Symmetry: D2
Subunit: 209 residues, 4 copies
Amino acid sequence: STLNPGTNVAKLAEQAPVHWVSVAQIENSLTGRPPMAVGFDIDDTVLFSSPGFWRGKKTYSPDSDDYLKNPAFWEKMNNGWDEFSIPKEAARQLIDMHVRRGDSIYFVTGRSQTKTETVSKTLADNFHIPAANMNPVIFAGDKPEQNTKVQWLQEKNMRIFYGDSDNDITAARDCGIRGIRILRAANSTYKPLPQAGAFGEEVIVNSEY
Amino acid sequence: PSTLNPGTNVAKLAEQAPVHWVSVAQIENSLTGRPPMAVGFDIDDTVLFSSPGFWRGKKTYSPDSDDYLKNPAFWEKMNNGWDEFSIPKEAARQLIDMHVRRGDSIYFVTGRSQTKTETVSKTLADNFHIPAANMNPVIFAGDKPEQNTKVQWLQEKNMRIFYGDSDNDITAARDCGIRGIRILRAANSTYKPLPQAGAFGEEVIVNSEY
Amino acid sequence: TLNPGTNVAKLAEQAPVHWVSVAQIENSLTGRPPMAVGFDIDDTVLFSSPGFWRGKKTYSPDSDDYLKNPAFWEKMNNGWDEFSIPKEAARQLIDMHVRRGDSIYFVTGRSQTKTETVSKTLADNFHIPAANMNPVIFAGDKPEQNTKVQWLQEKNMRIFYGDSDNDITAARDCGIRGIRILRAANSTYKPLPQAGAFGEEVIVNSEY
Amino acid sequence: TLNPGTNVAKLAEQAPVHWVSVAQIENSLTGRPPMAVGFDIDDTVLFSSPGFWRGKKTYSPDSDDYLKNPAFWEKMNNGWDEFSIPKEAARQLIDMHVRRGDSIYFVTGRSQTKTETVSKTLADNFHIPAANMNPVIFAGDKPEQNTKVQWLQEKNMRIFYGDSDNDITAARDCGIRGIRILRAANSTYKPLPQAGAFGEEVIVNSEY
Ligand SMILES: [Mg+2]
Ligand SMILES: [Mg+2]
Ligand SMILES: [Mg+2]
Ligand SMILES: [Mg+2]
């Protein structure tokens, strides 16, 4: 645009009409409630997994997103490339809180399903989730050999679902449960960034890292 | 405060307070289907930037303190002409227009002291073009210590929503079990310190400082 | 759309502006002998919108002709600034220059009037010693008055503070240091200017 | 407290930092013939935390001792950068300098290894022309190496870009222009530094 655009105080103080919440406010809203099932999307919600997707694109589809359909990519991505995935501090705070409550934690992902996967171990180890609260990662999809995200949220009776994408939030709305938005990091390779708060949902402050 | 070059970082730049921000459009949308009702507005730093008169009052009657706020002579001047210097807030214009469209009955409940005569009601009706059908003379609730003077009025007029910039405006609404919505107090207001909007978990209107 | 939402890139986005604090300005002048510095008045040291607002409502509700009404200026320059709110940023800047022993000048584009109490209101609100205080200078295109630029050169002002683009370009035209002050969002003089539009230094939190 | 709230003075508060854009940096170089410029690597041109994270988890999960493990560096310098994400801000800067015909140098504090594929990774991801590309320089305190300052002086670099305080001080010690890049909030190298702590220029939106 212009070389020296400058700014003004109206612009400096301008706020988007979003419902921001803190982990502490979420915990307070659960006070007294017995243990329950809660779910988390994985990519850009609990793990900054762009390193692996970046390498996959470079290796299998330098000019496009065809790698997301390449079975070879998914073998690598679900069996070791998450050793390069950086866990999010906001996720750590949320999981620690749910673990203290004794809730059952589920991870639901849209990644393609492979015969073997080490993602579940990576998550339990990185977030130090006790055996009683941990559950194997759930790969949701269209395949007749699997169920959709909405179906899993309902089957496990999850009461809250955390995610960074719009479809994570609409899935929760469709099931009539509490959908909470996590901010996607600016350096994620999954762009454009989504508009957090676009459905009037609660958005966790400072959740980009 | 004592650091010449404090610098900054991106975590700090993107840092957000956990506040429930709302827009006039969202408020309006949340009222769809609701029949006409009574709604209330605080005046100072809510619909009018009235600091000019309070500043002149302080300098005239009590340069070193806030005793002017208890001075009958100050209120006479403030309520009968000094608001000619008070600047209407744009955020208030938008809210008032919206409520007029809904056909709601509008009330102004202020902590200013009541005087024999007052020209504030007319100043408000004129500046915000409020039709006679929606207007109501300003209610001067006064301000007593250890007590919230506004509660009585919100109850008796059956106000369903109350807009205000001070904590006592929000707690008044909470005491009545109605919807209290916060308006940001301008940074150049002489009424300091600025309150912490959202301190009761209430809705706060974006960009409402002007 | 009722819910536009936002994202972290937008939340952390910064305009390329050269921000400075009063402390940094003071530090940049260490060891320098007392000099002459000037300040714009409206929205720089005083939030005078109250008087201009009343003036417009009184003399030209539908336009800005009140700015041409000598009746308005008589009121504005002789008492309506008692309703003007001094700016904290200006207070800090003025105190700093007084401590340095600098010579303070106020240059305004307000219309000149036979008498004025503005100089008094300024010296009183900012506690400016007589030694550093100078009567307000009214500039303009009249034959009996010099323009803003000419006044900066004549007094050899080395720094000029202002909220408007013309305050900064005047400084630029004289080869001196022009420093921008933010105009408050509730000022009636709209639209707000783009502080930093000339690559100049802008004082932080100077909207109040 | 549970509901701390906020106020407009806090919402508009700005730190006194000298922000600049890539366009402004380019403008400031108008007319200057080709020159040498240098870039720090980690968190400046590459978000390399993925490799540093895996190394930490592998060699010293509870400390930074992995930074002195030869086994770590062998893997980090010979392939783990295939997981490093190039920064958009660096891409723009590099494209701008390549267009000017400047010589681009990359100086790193990473431990030197017998071989390295970092140079190849950089040249490929940023499409740097052979005429502007130079092999990565590993600076350090070892007797076989030269310090960062000596390298900047040796190659006569006029500008040095970096995210850490030591990148800026190196430029300051050489009398050249040191420009700060923002370190991403999700970098594993914490705490984040205070960009602008030396009054240096900081590039806007350079965290990605
Ligand atoms: Mg995701
Ligand atoms: Mg009020
Ligand atoms: Mg001005
Ligand atoms: Mg670095």
